[PDB]
Design an enzyme around this catalytic site. Sequence first.
Site, PDB file in Angstrom:
ATOM      1  N   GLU A  35       0.804  -1.210   0.000  1.00 40.20           N
ATOM      2  CA  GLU A  35       0.000   0.000   0.000  1.00 40.20           C
ATOM      3  C   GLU A  35       0.827   1.245   0.000  1.00 40.20           C
ATOM      4  O   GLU A  35       0.606   2.232  -0.675  1.00 40.20           O
ATOM      5  CB  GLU A  35      -1.044   0.014   1.129  1.00 40.20           C
ATOM      6  N   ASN A  46      -6.946   9.146  -6.218  1.00 38.68           N
ATOM      7  CA  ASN A  46      -7.632   8.069  -7.001  1.00 38.68           C
ATOM      8  C   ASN A  46      -8.334   8.707  -8.169  1.00 38.68           C
ATOM      9  O   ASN A  46      -8.604   9.841  -8.246  1.00 38.68           O
ATOM     10  CB  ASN A  46      -8.562   7.358  -6.143  1.00 38.68           C
ATOM     11  N   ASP A  48     -11.375   8.539  -9.048  1.00 43.62           N
ATOM     12  CA  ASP A  48     -12.700   9.103  -8.700  1.00 43.62           C
ATOM     13  C   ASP A  48     -12.612  10.426  -7.937  1.00 43.62           C
ATOM     14  O   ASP A  48     -13.649  10.960  -7.451  1.00 43.62           O
ATOM     15  CB  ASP A  48     -13.551   8.069  -7.944  1.00 43.62           C
ATOM     16  N   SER A  50     -11.229  10.883  -4.897  1.00 45.00           N
ATOM     17  CA  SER A  50     -10.887  10.567  -3.531  1.00 45.00           C
ATOM     18  C   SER A  50      -9.334  10.464  -3.416  1.00 45.00           C
ATOM     19  O   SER A  50      -8.667  10.418  -4.450  1.00 45.00           O
ATOM     20  CB  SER A  50     -11.610   9.301  -3.058  1.00 45.00           C
ATOM     21  N   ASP A  52      -6.254   8.334  -1.057  1.00 46.35           N
ATOM     22  CA  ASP A  52      -5.828   7.356  -0.045  1.00 46.35           C
ATOM     23  C   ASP A  52      -4.752   7.867   0.879  1.00 46.35           C
ATOM     24  O   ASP A  52      -3.802   8.488   0.352  1.00 46.35           O
ATOM     25  CB  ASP A  52      -5.326   6.080  -0.757  1.00 46.35           C
ATOM     26  N   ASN A  59      -9.239   5.398   2.388  1.00 49.79           N
ATOM     27  CA  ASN A  59      -9.766   6.192   1.285  1.00 49.79           C
ATOM     28  C   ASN A  59     -10.780   7.187   1.805  1.00 49.79           C
ATOM     29  O   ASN A  59     -11.697   6.801   2.517  1.00 49.79           O
ATOM     30  CB  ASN A  59     -10.478   5.318   0.324  1.00 49.79           C
TER      31      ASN A  59
END
Length: 129
Positions: A35, A46, A48, A50, A52, A59
């Site tokens: 990660e 991301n 979309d 968003s 992380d 998220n």
Amino acid sequence: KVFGRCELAAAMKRHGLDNYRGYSLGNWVCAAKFESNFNTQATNRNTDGSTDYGILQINSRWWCNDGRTPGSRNLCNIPCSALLSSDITASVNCAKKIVSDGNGMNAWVAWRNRCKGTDVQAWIRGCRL
Ligand SMILES: Nc1cccc(O)c1
Ligand SMILES: Nc1cccc(O)c1
Ligand SMILES: [Cl-]
Ligand SMILES: [Cl-]
Ligand SMILES: [Cl-]
Ligand SMILES: [Cl-]
Ligand SMILES: [Cl-]
Ligand code: NA
Ligand code: NA
């Protein structure tokens, strides 16, 4: 903070991740490695919109507030910035909620693609725990 492997394993164990919801410690360490490379300050936008955050790349669409993800929720009821601390408490506490949400550790795509099915105990071999 960039953790060492064993250093993180120990911290995650102290914070109750070992066998949490049946997931042995090496699952959590493996997930953190892929990660975030064990870096608590990792952030990644991301597709979309968003983002992380942190060592387990939690998220902002669902879990934390960053003030810039319209229509999102804050189910861990924390600012996303809390997830970047050198202290892993907030990330661990939110991860416990995430892994309890119905899909277990499959919520972390990197765990599903890189750790699930592998010898994850490798990630804690050698460590004083
Ligand atoms: N419709 C909606 C859903 C979540 C957050 C928000 O501000 C609006
Ligand atoms: N079948 C299999 C082997 C290892 C781990 C796992 O999740 C499933
Ligand atoms: Cl490593
Ligand atoms: Cl927002
Ligand atoms: Cl810590
Ligand atoms: Cl599960
Ligand atoms: Cl393990
Ligand atoms: Na196991
Ligand atoms: Na949010």
